[PDB]
mmCIF file with all atom_site columns, C-alpha atoms in Angstrom:
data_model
loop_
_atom_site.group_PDB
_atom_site.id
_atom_site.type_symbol
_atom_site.label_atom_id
_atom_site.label_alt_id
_atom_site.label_comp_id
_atom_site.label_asym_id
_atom_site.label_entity_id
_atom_site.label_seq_id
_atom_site.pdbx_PDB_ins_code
_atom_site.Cartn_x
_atom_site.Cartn_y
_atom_site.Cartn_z
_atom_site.occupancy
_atom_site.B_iso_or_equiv
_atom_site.pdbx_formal_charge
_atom_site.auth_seq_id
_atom_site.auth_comp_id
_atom_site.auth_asym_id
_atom_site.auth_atom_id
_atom_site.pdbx_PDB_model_num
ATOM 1   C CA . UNK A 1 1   ? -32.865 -13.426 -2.364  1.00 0.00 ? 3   UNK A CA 1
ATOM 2   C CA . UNK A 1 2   ? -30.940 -15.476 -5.362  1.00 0.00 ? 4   UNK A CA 1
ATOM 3   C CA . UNK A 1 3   ? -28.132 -13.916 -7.080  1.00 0.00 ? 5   UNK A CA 1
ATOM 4   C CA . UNK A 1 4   ? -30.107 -12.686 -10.304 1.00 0.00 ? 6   UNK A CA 1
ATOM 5   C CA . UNK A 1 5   ? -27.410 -14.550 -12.959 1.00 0.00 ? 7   UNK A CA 1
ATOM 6   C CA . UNK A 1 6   ? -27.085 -11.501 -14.967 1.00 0.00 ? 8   UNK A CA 1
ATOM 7   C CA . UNK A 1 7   ? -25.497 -9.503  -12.500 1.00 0.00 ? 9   UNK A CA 1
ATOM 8   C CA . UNK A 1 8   ? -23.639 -12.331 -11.600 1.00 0.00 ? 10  UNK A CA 1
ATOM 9   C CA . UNK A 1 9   ? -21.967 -12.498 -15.422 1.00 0.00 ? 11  UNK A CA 1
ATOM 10  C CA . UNK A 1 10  ? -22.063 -8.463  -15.001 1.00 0.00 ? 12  UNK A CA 1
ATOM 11  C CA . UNK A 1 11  ? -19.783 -8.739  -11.612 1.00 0.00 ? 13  UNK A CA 1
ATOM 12  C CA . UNK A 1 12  ? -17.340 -11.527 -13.041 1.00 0.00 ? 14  UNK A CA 1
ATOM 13  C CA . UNK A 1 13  ? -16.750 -9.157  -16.341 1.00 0.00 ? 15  UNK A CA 1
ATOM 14  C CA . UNK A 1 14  ? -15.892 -6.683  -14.022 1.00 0.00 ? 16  UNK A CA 1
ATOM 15  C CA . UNK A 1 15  ? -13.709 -8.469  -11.782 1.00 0.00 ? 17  UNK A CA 1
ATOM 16  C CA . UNK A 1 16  ? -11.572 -10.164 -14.463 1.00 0.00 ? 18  UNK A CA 1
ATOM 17  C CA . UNK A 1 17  ? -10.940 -6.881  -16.477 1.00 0.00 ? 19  UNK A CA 1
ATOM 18  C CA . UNK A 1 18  ? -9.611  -5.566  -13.141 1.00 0.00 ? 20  UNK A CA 1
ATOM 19  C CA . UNK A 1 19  ? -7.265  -7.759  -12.814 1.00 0.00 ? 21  UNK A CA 1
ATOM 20  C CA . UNK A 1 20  ? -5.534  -8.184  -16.579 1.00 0.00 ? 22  UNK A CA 1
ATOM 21  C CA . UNK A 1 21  ? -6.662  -4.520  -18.071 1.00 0.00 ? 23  UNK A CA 1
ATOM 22  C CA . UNK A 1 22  ? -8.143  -6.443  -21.230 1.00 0.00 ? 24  UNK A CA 1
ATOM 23  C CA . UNK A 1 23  ? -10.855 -4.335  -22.613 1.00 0.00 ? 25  UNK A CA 1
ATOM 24  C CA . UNK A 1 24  ? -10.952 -6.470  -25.799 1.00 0.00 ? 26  UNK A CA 1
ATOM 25  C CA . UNK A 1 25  ? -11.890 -9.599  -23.802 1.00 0.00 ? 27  UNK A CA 1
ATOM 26  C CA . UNK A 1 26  ? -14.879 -7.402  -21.362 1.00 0.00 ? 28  UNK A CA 1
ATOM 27  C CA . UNK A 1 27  ? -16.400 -6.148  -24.578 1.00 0.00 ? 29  UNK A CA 1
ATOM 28  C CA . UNK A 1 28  ? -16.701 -9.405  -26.050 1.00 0.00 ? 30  UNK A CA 1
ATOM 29  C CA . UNK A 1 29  ? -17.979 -10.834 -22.670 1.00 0.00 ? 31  UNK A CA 1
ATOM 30  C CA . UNK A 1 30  ? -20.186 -7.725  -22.336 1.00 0.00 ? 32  UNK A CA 1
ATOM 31  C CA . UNK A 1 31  ? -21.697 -8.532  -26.412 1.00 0.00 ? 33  UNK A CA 1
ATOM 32  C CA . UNK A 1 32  ? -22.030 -11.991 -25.554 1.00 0.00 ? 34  UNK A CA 1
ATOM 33  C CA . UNK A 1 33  ? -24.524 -11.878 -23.124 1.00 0.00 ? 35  UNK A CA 1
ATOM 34  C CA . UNK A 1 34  ? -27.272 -10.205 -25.859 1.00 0.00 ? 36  UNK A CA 1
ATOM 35  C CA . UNK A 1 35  ? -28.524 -7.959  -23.581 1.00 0.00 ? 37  UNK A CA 1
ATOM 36  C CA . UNK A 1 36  ? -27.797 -4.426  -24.828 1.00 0.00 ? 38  UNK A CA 1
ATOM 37  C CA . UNK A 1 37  ? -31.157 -3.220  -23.009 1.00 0.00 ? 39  UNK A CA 1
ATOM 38  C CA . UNK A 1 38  ? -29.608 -3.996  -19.648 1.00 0.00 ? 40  UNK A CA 1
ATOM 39  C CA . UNK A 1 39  ? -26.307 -2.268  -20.343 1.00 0.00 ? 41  UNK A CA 1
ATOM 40  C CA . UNK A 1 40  ? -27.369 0.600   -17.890 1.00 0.00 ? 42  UNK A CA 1
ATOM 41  C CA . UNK A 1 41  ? -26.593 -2.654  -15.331 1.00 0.00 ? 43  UNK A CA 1
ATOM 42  C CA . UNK A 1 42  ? -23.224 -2.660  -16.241 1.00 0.00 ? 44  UNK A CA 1
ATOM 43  C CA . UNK A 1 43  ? -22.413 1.262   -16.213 1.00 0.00 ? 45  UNK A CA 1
ATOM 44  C CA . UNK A 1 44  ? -24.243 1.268   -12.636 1.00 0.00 ? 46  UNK A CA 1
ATOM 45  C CA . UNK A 1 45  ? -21.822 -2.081  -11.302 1.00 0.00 ? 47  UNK A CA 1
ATOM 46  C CA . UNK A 1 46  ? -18.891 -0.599  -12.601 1.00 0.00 ? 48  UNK A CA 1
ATOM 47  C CA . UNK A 1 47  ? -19.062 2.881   -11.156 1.00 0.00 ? 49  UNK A CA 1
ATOM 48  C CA . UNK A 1 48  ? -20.372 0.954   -7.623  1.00 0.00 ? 50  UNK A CA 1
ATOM 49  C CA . UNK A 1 49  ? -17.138 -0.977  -7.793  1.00 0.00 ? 51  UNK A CA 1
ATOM 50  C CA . UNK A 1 50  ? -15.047 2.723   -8.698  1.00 0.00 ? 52  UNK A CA 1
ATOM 51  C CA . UNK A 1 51  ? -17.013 4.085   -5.050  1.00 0.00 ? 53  UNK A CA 1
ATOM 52  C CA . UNK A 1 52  ? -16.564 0.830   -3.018  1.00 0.00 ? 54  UNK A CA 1
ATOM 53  C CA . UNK A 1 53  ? -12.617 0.556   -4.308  1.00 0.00 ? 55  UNK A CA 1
ATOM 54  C CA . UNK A 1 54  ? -9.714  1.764   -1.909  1.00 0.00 ? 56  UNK A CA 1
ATOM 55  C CA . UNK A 1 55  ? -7.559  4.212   -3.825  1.00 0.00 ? 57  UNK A CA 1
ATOM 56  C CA . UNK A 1 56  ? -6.792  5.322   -7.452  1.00 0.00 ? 58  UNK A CA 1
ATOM 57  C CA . UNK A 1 57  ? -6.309  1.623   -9.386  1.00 0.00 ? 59  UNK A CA 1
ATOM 58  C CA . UNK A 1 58  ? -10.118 1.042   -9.800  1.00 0.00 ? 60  UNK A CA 1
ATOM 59  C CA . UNK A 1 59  ? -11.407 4.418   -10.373 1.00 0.00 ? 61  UNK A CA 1
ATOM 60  C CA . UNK A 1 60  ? -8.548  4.935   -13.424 1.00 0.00 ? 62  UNK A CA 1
ATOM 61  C CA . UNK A 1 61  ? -9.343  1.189   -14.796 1.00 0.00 ? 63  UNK A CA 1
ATOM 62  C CA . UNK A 1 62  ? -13.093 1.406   -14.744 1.00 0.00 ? 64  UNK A CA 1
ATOM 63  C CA . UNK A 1 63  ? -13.079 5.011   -16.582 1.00 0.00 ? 65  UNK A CA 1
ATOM 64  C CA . UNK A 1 64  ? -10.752 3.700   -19.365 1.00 0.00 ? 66  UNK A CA 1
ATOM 65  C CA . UNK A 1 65  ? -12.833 1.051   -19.729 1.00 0.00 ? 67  UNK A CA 1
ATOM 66  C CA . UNK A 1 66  ? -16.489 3.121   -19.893 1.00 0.00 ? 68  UNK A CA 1
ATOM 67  C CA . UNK A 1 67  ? -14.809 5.162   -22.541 1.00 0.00 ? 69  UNK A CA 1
ATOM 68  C CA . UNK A 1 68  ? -13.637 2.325   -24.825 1.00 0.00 ? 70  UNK A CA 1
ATOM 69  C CA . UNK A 1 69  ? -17.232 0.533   -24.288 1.00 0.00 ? 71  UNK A CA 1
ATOM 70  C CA . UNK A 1 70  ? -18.774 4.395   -25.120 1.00 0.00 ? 72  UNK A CA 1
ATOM 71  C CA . UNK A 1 71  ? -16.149 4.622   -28.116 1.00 0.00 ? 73  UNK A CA 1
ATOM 72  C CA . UNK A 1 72  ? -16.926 1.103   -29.965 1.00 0.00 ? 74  UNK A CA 1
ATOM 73  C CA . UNK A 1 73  ? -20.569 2.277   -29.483 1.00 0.00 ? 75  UNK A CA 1
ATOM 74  C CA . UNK A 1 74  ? -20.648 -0.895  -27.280 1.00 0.00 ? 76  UNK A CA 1
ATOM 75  C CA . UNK A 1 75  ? -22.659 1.527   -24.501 1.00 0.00 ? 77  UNK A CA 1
ATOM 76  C CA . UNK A 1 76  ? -25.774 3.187   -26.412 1.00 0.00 ? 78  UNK A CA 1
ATOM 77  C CA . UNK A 1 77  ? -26.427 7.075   -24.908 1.00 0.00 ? 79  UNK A CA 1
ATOM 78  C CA . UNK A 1 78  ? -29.014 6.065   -23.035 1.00 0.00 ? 80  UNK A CA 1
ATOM 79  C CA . UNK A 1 79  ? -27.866 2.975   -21.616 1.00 0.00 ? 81  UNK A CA 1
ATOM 80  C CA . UNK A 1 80  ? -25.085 5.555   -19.814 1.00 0.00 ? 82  UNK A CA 1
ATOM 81  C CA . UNK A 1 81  ? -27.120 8.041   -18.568 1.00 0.00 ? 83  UNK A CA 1
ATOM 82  C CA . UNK A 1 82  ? -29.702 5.561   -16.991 1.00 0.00 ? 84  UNK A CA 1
ATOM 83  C CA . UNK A 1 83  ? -26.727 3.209   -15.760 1.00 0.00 ? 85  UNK A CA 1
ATOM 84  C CA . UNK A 1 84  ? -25.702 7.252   -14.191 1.00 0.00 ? 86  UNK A CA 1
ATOM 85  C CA . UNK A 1 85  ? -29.164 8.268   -12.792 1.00 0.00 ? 87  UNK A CA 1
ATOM 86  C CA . UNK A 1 86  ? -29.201 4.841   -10.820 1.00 0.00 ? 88  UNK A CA 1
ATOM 87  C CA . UNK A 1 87  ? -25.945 5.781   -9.408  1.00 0.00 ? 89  UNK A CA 1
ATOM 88  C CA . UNK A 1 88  ? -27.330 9.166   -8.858  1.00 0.00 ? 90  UNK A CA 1
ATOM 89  C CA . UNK A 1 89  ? -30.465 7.339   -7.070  1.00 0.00 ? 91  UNK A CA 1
ATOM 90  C CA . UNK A 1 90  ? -28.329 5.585   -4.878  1.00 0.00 ? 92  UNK A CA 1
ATOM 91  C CA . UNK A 1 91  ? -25.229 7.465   -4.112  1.00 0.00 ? 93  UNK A CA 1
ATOM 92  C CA . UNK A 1 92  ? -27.181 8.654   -0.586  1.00 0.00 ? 94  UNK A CA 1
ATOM 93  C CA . UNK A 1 93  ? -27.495 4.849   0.379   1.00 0.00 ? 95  UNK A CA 1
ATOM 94  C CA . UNK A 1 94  ? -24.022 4.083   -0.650  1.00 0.00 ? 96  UNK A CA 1
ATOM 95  C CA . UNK A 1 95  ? -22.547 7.281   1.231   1.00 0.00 ? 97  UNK A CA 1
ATOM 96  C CA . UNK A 1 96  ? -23.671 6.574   4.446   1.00 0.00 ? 98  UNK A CA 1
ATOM 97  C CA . UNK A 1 97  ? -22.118 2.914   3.983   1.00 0.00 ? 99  UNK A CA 1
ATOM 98  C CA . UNK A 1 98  ? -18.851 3.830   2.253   1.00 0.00 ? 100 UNK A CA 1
ATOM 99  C CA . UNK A 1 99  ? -17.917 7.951   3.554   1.00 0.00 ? 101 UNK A CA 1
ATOM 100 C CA . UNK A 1 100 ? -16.362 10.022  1.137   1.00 0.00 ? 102 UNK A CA 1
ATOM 101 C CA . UNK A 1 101 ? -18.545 8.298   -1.965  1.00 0.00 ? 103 UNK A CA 1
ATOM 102 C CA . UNK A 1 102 ? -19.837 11.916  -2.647  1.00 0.00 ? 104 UNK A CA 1
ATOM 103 C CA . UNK A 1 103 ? -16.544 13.029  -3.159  1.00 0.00 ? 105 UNK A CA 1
ATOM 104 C CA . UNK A 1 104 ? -14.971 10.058  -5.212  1.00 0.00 ? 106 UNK A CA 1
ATOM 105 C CA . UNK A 1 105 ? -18.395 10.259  -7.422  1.00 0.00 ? 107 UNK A CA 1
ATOM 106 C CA . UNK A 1 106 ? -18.001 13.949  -8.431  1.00 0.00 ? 108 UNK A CA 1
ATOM 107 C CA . UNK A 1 107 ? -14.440 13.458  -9.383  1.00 0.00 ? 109 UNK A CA 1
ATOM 108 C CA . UNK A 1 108 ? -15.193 10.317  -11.456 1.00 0.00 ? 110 UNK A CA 1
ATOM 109 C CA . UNK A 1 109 ? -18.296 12.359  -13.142 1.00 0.00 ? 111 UNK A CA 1
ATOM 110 C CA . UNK A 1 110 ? -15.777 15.060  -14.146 1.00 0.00 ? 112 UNK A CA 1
ATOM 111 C CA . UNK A 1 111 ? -13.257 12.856  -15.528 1.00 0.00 ? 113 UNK A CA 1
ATOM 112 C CA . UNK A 1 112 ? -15.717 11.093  -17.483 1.00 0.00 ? 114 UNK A CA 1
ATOM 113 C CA . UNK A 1 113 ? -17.276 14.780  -18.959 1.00 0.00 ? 115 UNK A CA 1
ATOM 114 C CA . UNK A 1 114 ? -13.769 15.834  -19.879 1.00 0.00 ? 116 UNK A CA 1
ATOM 115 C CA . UNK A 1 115 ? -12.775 12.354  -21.879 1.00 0.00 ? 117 UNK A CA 1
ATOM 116 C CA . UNK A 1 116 ? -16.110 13.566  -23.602 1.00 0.00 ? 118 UNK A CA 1
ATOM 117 C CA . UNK A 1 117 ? -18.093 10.444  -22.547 1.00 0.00 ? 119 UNK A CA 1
ATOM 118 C CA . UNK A 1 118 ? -20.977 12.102  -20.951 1.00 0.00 ? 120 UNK A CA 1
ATOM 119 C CA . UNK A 1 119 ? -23.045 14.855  -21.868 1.00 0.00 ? 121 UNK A CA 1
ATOM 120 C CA . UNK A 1 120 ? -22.666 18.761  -19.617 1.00 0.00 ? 122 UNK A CA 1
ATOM 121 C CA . UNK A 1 121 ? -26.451 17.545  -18.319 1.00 0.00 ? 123 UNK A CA 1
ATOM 122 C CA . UNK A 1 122 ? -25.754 14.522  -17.208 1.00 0.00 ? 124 UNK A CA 1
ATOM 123 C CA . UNK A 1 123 ? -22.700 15.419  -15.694 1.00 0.00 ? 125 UNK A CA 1
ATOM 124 C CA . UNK A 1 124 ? -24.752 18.777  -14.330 1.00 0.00 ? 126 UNK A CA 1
ATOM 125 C CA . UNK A 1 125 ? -27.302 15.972  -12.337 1.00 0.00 ? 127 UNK A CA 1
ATOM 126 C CA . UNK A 1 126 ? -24.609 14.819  -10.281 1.00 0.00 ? 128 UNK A CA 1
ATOM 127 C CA . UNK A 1 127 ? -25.553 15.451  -6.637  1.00 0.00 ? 129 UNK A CA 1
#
């Protein structure tokens, strides 16, 4: 199964921003790729990398960086709460290969409801 080049371009956004903390360069990666309709791709990779990551660095990085893509209007409503349903889809799969996922997911859900990002619904399907 070939790496499908979009969420290879997706990953390497990701990856780069972790490392420098530039938001301005990962939104104008993110616009670049003209592909607003596959967003929800990007909002499901991200919060993957926040469950897969060991300790706080990640999980604080990733949410200041949803809520400046949310801000700029960068990430449409729907494009987050399908990129958070997928998560939601998952998170059993993802549990049973990284323990404690649950746990780091609710917390992450929260702290994205109370920077206003996501809507009390959304936030209410987390499992």
């Amino acid at each position: 199964q070939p790496v499908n080049h979009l969420v290879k371009e997706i990953d390497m956004l990701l990856k780069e921003y972790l490392l420098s903390g530039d938001i301005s360069e990962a939104e104008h990666c993110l616009k670049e790729l003209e592909v607003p309709h596959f967003h929800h791709e990007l909002v499901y990779e991200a919060i993957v990398m926040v469950l897969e990551s060991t300790g706080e660095s990640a999980f604080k990085m990733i949410l200041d960086l949803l809520k400046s893509l949310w801000k700029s209007s960068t990430i449409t409503i729907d494009q987050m709460k399908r990129g958070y349903e997928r998560i939601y889809n998952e998170i059993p799969d993802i549990n049973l290969d990284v323990p404690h996922s649950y746990s780091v997911l609710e917390r992450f859900v929260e702290e994205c409801f109370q920077a206003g990002i996501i809507s009390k619904q959304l936030r209410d399907l987390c499992p």
